[PDB]
Design an enzyme around this catalytic site. Structure first.
Site, mmCIF file in Angstrom:
data_model
loop_
_atom_site.group_PDB
_atom_site.id
_atom_site.type_symbol
_atom_site.label_atom_id
_atom_site.label_comp_id
_atom_site.label_asym_id
_atom_site.label_seq_id
_atom_site.Cartn_x
_atom_site.Cartn_y
_atom_site.Cartn_z
ATOM 1 N N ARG B 157 0.817 -1.198 0.000
ATOM 2 C CA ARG B 157 0.000 0.000 0.000
ATOM 3 C C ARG B 157 0.852 1.249 0.000
ATOM 4 O O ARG B 157 0.834 2.031 -0.950
ATOM 5 C CB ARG B 157 -0.952 -0.060 1.201
ATOM 6 C CG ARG B 157 -1.380 1.255 1.835
ATOM 7 C CD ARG B 157 -2.052 2.258 0.941
ATOM 8 N NE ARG B 157 -2.346 3.459 1.727
ATOM 9 C CZ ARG B 157 -3.123 4.463 1.328
ATOM 10 N NH1 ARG B 157 -3.701 4.430 0.153
ATOM 11 N NH2 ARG B 157 -3.337 5.497 2.109
ATOM 12 N N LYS B 168 1.818 11.560 -11.246
ATOM 13 C CA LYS B 168 1.715 13.010 -11.088
ATOM 14 C C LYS B 168 2.800 13.773 -11.855
ATOM 15 O O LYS B 168 2.552 14.854 -12.416
ATOM 16 C CB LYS B 168 1.768 13.369 -9.609
ATOM 17 C CG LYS B 168 0.627 12.827 -8.819
ATOM 18 C CD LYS B 168 0.814 13.179 -7.356
ATOM 19 C CE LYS B 168 -0.340 12.655 -6.511
ATOM 20 N NZ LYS B 168 -0.054 12.835 -5.065
ATOM 21 N N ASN B 194 -3.526 16.230 -1.376
ATOM 22 C CA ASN B 194 -4.865 16.450 -1.903
ATOM 23 C C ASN B 194 -5.777 16.083 -0.743
ATOM 24 O O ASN B 194 -6.397 15.011 -0.731
ATOM 25 C CB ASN B 194 -5.082 15.508 -3.088
ATOM 26 C CG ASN B 194 -6.510 15.508 -3.600
ATOM 27 O OD1 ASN B 194 -7.490 15.638 -2.835
ATOM 28 N ND2 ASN B 194 -6.646 15.316 -4.909
ATOM 29 N N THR B 238 3.079 7.324 2.959
ATOM 30 C CA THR B 238 2.852 7.148 1.531
ATOM 31 C C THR B 238 3.382 8.415 0.834
ATOM 32 O O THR B 238 4.200 8.326 -0.101
ATOM 33 C CB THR B 238 1.354 6.928 1.184
ATOM 34 O OG1 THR B 238 0.829 5.837 1.955
ATOM 35 C CG2 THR B 238 1.206 6.595 -0.300
ATOM 36 N N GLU B 242 6.403 9.546 -1.975
ATOM 37 C CA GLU B 242 6.209 10.282 -3.209
ATOM 38 C C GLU B 242 7.270 11.363 -3.381
ATOM 39 O O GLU B 242 7.864 11.483 -4.463
ATOM 40 C CB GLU B 242 4.813 10.871 -3.270
ATOM 41 C CG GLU B 242 3.741 9.810 -3.267
ATOM 42 C CD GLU B 242 2.348 10.395 -3.158
ATOM 43 O OE1 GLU B 242 1.942 10.724 -2.032
ATOM 44 O OE2 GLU B 242 1.654 10.537 -4.185
HETATM 45 O O1 LIG Z 1 -2.994 11.476 -4.627
HETATM 46 C C1 LIG Z 1 -3.219 10.467 -3.965
HETATM 47 O O2 LIG Z 1 -4.351 9.934 -4.048
HETATM 48 C C2 LIG Z 1 -2.055 9.927 -3.063
HETATM 49 C C3 LIG Z 1 -2.489 9.074 -1.852
HETATM 50 C C4 LIG Z 1 -2.609 9.680 -0.454
HETATM 51 C C5 LIG Z 1 -2.815 8.529 0.616
HETATM 52 O O3 LIG Z 1 -1.887 8.190 1.404
HETATM 53 O O4 LIG Z 1 -3.934 7.949 0.680
HETATM 54 C C6 LIG Z 1 -3.798 10.634 -0.488
HETATM 55 C C7 LIG Z 1 -3.790 11.959 -0.799
HETATM 56 C C8 LIG Z 1 -2.523 12.612 -1.297
HETATM 57 O O5 LIG Z 1 -2.461 13.755 -0.453
HETATM 58 C C9 LIG Z 1 -1.310 11.618 -1.428
HETATM 59 C C10 LIG Z 1 -1.336 10.539 -0.318
HETATM 60 O O6 LIG Z 1 -1.116 10.929 -2.682
#
Ligand SMILES: O=C(O)[C@@H]1C[C@]2(C(=O)O)C=C[C@@H](O)[C@@H](C2)O1
Ligand SMILES: O=C(O)[C@@H]1C[C@]2(C(=O)O)C=C[C@@H](O)[C@@H](C2)O1
Ligand SMILES: N[C@@H](Cc1c[nH]c2ccccc12)C(=O)O
Ligand SMILES: N[C@@H](Cc1c[nH]c2ccccc12)C(=O)O
EC number: 5.4.99.5
Lengths: 252, 252
Positions: B157, B168, B194, B238, B242
């Protein structure tokens, strides 16, 4: 149960009765804290937005330790049932000493789990009892003070183990004397555990939570959570103090 | 999303859909682990009671690394979405290579947070999801194997970040190319975050936890804790992957 009647203090029943009155106190305290968000910032040690002049620790830390000092001065900690969250920072009383007979062993003050309680409280309990998740940017004081109410009741309750522990020792010295020399944890643990009682306790909690946790005209406190808290934390650490107090009982 | 259709792999939506299916997997895995005590001894490197012939590490360590070796042999790690917890110990596949088109940059295998994940999992997650605190003296295997299920899902995950990251970048090279040359963390961090999505995620989790975490005929998993875990750890690391993947993106 009066502190100047060692006999009523060391009675296992009286002790349980007192732990019971506390159940409500804690519930009430939880219910009060439940009105606010989790407020992460209050618990972060040295948070940039809340730098406290000459102090390494959390906002909560400052507030709690300070209160402990003030109280120490007016005899708070010379009461056996009160164990300090910040023993390294408490002064001496400027009031004539209440001379309580010894009812516990001399090292009792040294038996002290607040360090744990506070951590577990912050990490495990808060998430279970607060409204939202996040900082209530202008209620940190409100939250902290409440947190302290919870913490002081939890600590009183939990550290009551010492009294129980002593009570049980007294009631079968040999059995325990044997166990202690052996450092036989599991054996001691077995003898102090009385599941019947533990169970009846969780039963009361569920009812109380139902009736207290709802405006009688909902759910400021979840019965399941109240049980979880007790079952997983309160009651486990109380025993954890009994063994501890027990090991050092023959000590000297 | 198929690994032999680079286009479906690098689609930001498809990627999010896949992360979503994982939410349940993780929940299920947590729920399973929740049946056992914390079992400290499993995680202690070189525990006296569990000395493993020619091996420096924890019981869990042994079990996990071994499994990684066996799997490596049958092509586990030549799959881009699988990043090894023990890269220093994995062999080559004795099966004809699946020749996956490159969908990520060549250094991807090098982007690897398992070291962290494992530590945080053991220190922070376990305490949140296990029954009791203590060693279940005859379930270490049961606990370890489960731990591994959790760990492998978390890692899959989390390391999925690489795919997102790449996705991106592709979608506005200049903006990112600019940011990367600048080593502008905060800027990059800002662009990938986001919050809207992050929020909707924590919303699903809470519901799932409610319905899955209780026998429909309670609380093998606490919704609040599930959120905490994600909010504090899963989602933060996560992103952390990135940026990392991003910095090295222009690399060579
Ligand atoms: O664009 C995304 O969808 C991903 C996944 C993420 C997560 O950890 O769920 C969710 C929101 C974003 O801020 C980051 C982290 O990139
Ligand atoms: O004997 C007792 O009454 C005490 C209190 C205790 C609790 O935490 O409520 C309840 C049952 C026992 O197993 C332990 C822990 O000692
Ligand atoms: N109950 C004891 C000790 C005590 C409990 N809580 C306190 C708070 C402040 C000062 C003292 C106390 C007494 O007041 O004699
Ligand atoms: N999914 C890929 C790689 C893989 C994932 N998990 C595995 C476990 C063992 C062996 C291979 C794998 C495949 O099996 O082709």
């Amino acid at each position: 149960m009066d502190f100047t009647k060692p006999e009523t203090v060391l009675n296992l029943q009286n002790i349980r009765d007192e732990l019971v009155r506390m159940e409500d106190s804690i519930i009430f305290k939880f219910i009060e804290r439940s009105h606010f968000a989790t407020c992460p910032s209050v618990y972060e040690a040295n948070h940039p937005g809340l730098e406290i002049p000459n102090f390494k620790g959390s906002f909560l830390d400052w507030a709690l330790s300070n209160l402990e000092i003030a109280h120490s001065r007016i005899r708070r900690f010379e009461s056996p049932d009160e164990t300090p969250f910040f023993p390294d920072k408490i002064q001496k009383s400027f009031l004539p000493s209440i001379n309580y007979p010894q009812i516990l062993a001399p090292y009792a003050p040294e038996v002290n789990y607040n360090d744990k309680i506070k951590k577990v409280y912050i990490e495990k309990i808060i998430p279970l009892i607060s409204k939202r998740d996040g900082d209530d940017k202008n209620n940190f004081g409100s939250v902290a003070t409440r947190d302290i109410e919870c913490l002081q009741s939890l600590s009183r309750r939990i550290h009551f183990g010492k009294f129980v522990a002593e009570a049980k020792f007294q009631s079968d010295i040999p059995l325990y004397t044997k166990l202690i020399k052996s450092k036989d944890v599991e054996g001691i643990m077995k003898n102090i555990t009385n599941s019947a009682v533990e169970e009846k306790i969780l039963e009361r909690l569920t009812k109380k939570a139902e009736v207290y946790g709802v405006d009688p005209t909902e759910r400021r406190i979840t019965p399941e959570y109240l049980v979880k808290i007790y079952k997983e934390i309160v009651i486990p650490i109380t025993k954890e103090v009994e063994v501890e107090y027990l090991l050092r009982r023959l000590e000297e």
